Amino acid sequence: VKTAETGYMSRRLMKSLEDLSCQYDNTVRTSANGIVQFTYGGDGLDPLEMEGNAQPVNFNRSWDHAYNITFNNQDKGLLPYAIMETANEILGPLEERLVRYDNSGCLVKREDLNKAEYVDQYDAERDFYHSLREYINGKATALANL
Amino acid sequence: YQCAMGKQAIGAIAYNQFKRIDTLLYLMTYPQQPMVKTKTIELIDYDKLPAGQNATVAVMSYSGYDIEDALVLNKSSIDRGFGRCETRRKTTTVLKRYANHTQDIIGGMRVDENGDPIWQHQSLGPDGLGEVGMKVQSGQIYINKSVPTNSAQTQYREAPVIYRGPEPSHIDQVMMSVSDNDQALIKVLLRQNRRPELGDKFSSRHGQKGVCGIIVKQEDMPFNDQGIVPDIIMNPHGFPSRMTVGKMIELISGKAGVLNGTLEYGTCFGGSKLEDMSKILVDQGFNYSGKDMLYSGITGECLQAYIFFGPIYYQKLKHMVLDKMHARARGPRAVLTRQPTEGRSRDGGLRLGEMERDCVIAYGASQLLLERLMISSDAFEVDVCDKCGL
Amino acid sequence: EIALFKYRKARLEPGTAIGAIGAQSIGEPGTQMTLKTFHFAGVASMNVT
Amino acid sequence: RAGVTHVLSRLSYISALGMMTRISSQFEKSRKVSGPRALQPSQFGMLCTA
Amino acid sequence: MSNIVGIEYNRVTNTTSTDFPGFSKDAENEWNVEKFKKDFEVNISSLDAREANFDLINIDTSIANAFRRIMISEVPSVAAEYVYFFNNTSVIQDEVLAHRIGLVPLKVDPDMLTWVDSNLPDDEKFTDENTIVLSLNVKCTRNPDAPKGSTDPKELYNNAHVYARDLKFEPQGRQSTTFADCPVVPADPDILLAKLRPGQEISLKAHCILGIGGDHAKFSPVSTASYRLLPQINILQPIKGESARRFQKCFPPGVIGIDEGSDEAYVKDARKDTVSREVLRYEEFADKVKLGRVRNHFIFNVESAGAMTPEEIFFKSVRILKNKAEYLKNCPITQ
Amino acid sequence: XXXXXXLKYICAECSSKLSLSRTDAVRCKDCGHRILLKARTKRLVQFEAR
Amino acid sequence: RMPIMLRSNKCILYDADESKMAKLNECPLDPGGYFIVNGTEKVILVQEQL
Amino acid sequence: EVAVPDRVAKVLTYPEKVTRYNRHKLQELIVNGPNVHPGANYLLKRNE
Amino acid sequence: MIVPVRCFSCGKVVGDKWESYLNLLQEDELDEGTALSRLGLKRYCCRRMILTHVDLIEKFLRYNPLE
Amino acid sequence: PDREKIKLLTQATSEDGTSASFQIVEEDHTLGNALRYVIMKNPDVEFCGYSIPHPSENLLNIRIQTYGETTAVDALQKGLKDLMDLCDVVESKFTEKIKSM
Amino acid sequence: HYAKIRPWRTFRLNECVCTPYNADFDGDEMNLHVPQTEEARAEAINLMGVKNNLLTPKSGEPIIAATQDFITGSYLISHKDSFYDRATLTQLLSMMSDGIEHFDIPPPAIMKPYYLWTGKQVFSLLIKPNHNSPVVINLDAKNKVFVPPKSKSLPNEMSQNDGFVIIRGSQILSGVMDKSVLGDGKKHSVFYTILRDYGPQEAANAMNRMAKLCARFLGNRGFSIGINDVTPADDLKQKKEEL
RNA sequence: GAGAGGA
């Protein structure tokens, strides 16, 4: 009694969303070139290749993999400040690449960056970079507290 | 599920099953009375015309070819005759008398050089009706029927009946008679002896339907202290999620009854108690739970777990792979839309419908979609006017 | 490096038939949604669908 | 009324016996109505409950 | 544990070989003859015309299982392969009757024939030294006596049953001399081949050839060739008293006994015991009994279908394994 | 070497052999039975005992 | 001519015991209750109604 | 991978075009014919 | 139809014993178990080959078309 | 001479032997298990194992990995010779036992 | 799929890939199409390929993985009671492969009484059978039946049962194989990690090795369900009746 | 055309 109803529902659901494509400007669009979404899901991340709960990196397992792949017995463990400096010199050159232009095309004056009225694309990337920095800061803080 | 699939279990049909010309009969060569009977089956005479055989089942994960409901049939038991079946199919022919006082002549049996019949008539006989006991193949006319071209007598268009089958079958009955209106009627029965090939469906009288996953030799099979090898090795994973404890009790009751030389009763709300069967099983020197300790047939050492071992009444179902294999490259196409036909009696393709094309769309495969739904299905070179698009 | 690689890899590649993927992802689980009787978080009287 | 008579099934003996003593519901399809397709306790001993 | 495999109530432990170097720091048990020559032993128990029960001692499971497998489906035998029907009016379909005839064992000793070459046409594929021709010709007619009606169809119909002994044997050429002393006959002449009522005839001719067991079950020489590890029972913490009788009710009768006067349970003979681990169910014999099997002490029970003596079959199995190893050794190691 | 290897109808009721000439009848002769079965071929038929 | 249900008060198989049935090529264990129309075994299924 | 019967792998033909890399293989398949499995069913000439 | 010549699981030739088995049930009426054991059928595969067998050919032969 | 029964798979085989895989046609566990038992008894054999890749094919891939002393081919040859010796010992013992009876 | 030719009449496919199709082997049937152009064939094998579709698109969780009896074989191998000598270990390693992969035998877990390996060691060899295979997996997972350790302060490795699975450097340091480790539906599986870190080919190779291993280990080991596996204990009857 | 398996 449920098979037929589920089949009909799937058929019509597919008939609705039949022609939606992620265009090369990173906008989901329909056949008539009417933009339905400006970025898929707000982040442009395909769920097929996400490795965590609503995050794409699974920080703990990736950190363990990096630890094990590059573990030599005679290596000088850096101080936590050195770890943070490495994180900020690898992450932050990428953060500079995103500038958060205003809706009028001008640049935000560094005092109203988080004014909640100037958010746009590349916000997900900034949040991801901040999460990476926070995770590395947590590891360094654990080392310092030890 | 057992009530559903017990109707489609091949076996004895009637005492006159050999004097009968039906459209499609499935018969069992060596049907066997069930070990664990029921008070109902004595009343409906199911122990006199059974459909199944008592297979020595060993419930054990073996060979890997029995993962999901798949079975492991035992070669050297199929050879001795186990699941051997027969398919009888009738072909009728009416020699109608047309209103123009013209009949249909079954004259045939052409001869090539140096006498002898031609290959297509090699199994036809002098009278145009296939010789009883011969073998026919693709081609091999066995009813050489001719029909007048002036039905609306010399001009006889030949319209023979051709055996169009994938495997040879034998002619075992040819009946010629007339109906009330005095018109000739010929019924030819073709028998085909079938072997339990890989891919045939076997049921277990408990809803444990399965396919013959693999056929392995006798020596590559577990054996007990007495050298018994199982005929069927059913996977143990069919039980824990379907809760067919009745099947385990059937195995124990059957083993105990056959060791005691009697037929045990499995009937609803009663039947042979498990305690008596276990007492009989331990009296003969077997384990109280029916779990013997086997030797691996390929390494020759003990199996580190005792194996549920005993006779289970397994019935072979009619859904055989020989009748279901079907492939097409090119052939008949529909007259209207010029697309391949649908059935199997007509060599036709497999329909790739809306769900399948949506699945292809999901992958984002455009050239494959174009090839499947246009190039390999129906392509037409049309001439469209560039001014008025007609 | 691993985090950045797995992030730049985990972007919806252009040309993806995301509409069909979404429609199937929302319809196929419906084919397995056997009717289970539920209530509104501990309120037996308040029946829900 | 259509489909009153059925060709007797000849696969096993139990198939031909079970085609006899068979009952057909008057409902055509009963698409979503889970009433006539349920196992009413009132049929205990009257109809095969399996 | 040390050439013993324990039988527990829920499992079987220590079923592996562990008789090779590298199993321990002291790399002992390295292969060498003149040490296996003396340890190995054969104790031939009751040997009959169609059965042999010989115990093999101090061989690992691999070799014994290889012998068993070769015995079942490597030792050649002679059975009907092609059946030609001249007339079959019996109710049995022709293919079924041909299968029944093919399954019938033949008391023709192999090595008196040669392998048939499949690469030849049927007109000259079968020779006199290659195949054996068996004829059957049975015609059923009524019995013009005056017995009671509706009685058994043996004194009412003449030749109403067709047995396997109805298979005749006509030699061709040299077969008139080689098979003069021992004409080929069904090893079991009472096999009910077919049944038939008056007016029915079965007339056929079968070209029985030489085949291998792995090809078809009709070519297997033995009914079943098996073995089993010798059972072993350790009665520790003696169980003397009335409880001993209970301890006796588990094992088969001729397995353990109660010592006269001492009224103490003792092992009589473990060879008669089938390991049903019954004592492992009562939990009052948790430490009073320890079951097991001797991992390298098999007791083969070979029984033939009638073609040849079982000891000849086992000898052929050993020779076939040796021939296989030798031929593999002679075969060049190509890349 | 070598090893050689190498129109009648029956009434369904009277079980008697018949020979029907062209355009005479289709019934039996001993009785009036109208059903005839073709006799088995006299030609050799080969079956593998496999 | 009214078709006769198998093993009814009008059928010849009514009260036939293992010899009449054998002479008529009829299986003793056959259920009956079905008609033979155009040489086909057609059974009128029991119809349930309100 | 999926296993296919040779009874249907001999009707499910694939049209391979001669390309001077598989000319020998394709002509060997033609020599084999439509009965032995590693063979061929139909040949379509360039102009015909 | 008739008794299988060979017992599928083991291979024993059980075709010849059938008639003998019937006698052990008709004259000197034993039980089925004792009659089966007296014929040498020790393994239960050969036992179920004979015990659970229907002699259908007896019923089939009542309809011979050459009486 | 029959250069089909035994083949040495080159892809699996390492340089200068000491680890080699062999493909044997028309064989099954019957000889594979006995050969594995005999080879594993050699003091210089580190790895020895057979496997039938697919029951539809008569094949037997047997791999022997020895140490830097005896090549795998010589290990297989000695295993075959020792299997012949074992069969001869069993045959002789059985013959003398049956003759004595 | 890539076609292979076999004598029988049935479309035979590895059971691991039967979770997408929802195949049953109870008598199910399937359709097989053959693309007739190079473009269609290439698009099929590169976009619709099995190796490239190990994850379902609705959630990204793996869906092609160990089915029934493969999880059972893995659990029986990796159960802590398992201890294999050298001959048995080499036979297992030739069973998982086809006598073609060169195996670097690690030092045994137990050395002094005898030389005994462990099922976790043999599965770690299955993951990385050489020093050339690049599959080094670092993973921490938790099975479906995880019993926490006695002390709250203790890590999950010290579980009462095997429980938490710790794999470091492709060595299964602790834990047993399970549906949450080899099966489907979890993003912390061994196959999922192998795929996500080294492409679909290595995951396919590992799954093939596991399937070939478990196709023969259950046959040569024995695993059965009987009436004593479902019968209730003597005191269980009285306790149930009282309750 | 319409009766019924089937997955």
Ligand SMILES: CCC[C@@H](C)[C@H]1CC[C@H]2[C@@H]3[C@H](O)C[C@@H]4C[C@H](O)CC[C@]4(C)[C@H]3C[C@H](O)[C@]12C
């Ligand atoms: C290649 C097969 C040849 C076969 C016909 C010959 C060759 C060697 C013969 C055996 C040996 O003599 C040893 C035993 C001697 C006893 O006295 C009788 C039994 C015994 C097993 C013999 C049987 C038979 O006679 C054999 C197998």
Ligand SMILES: [Mg+2]
């Ligand atoms: Mg299914």
Ligand SMILES: [Zn+2]
């Ligand atoms: Zn125009």
Ligand SMILES: [Zn+2]
């Ligand atoms: Zn007549």
Ligand SMILES: [Zn+2]
């Ligand atoms: Zn038997």
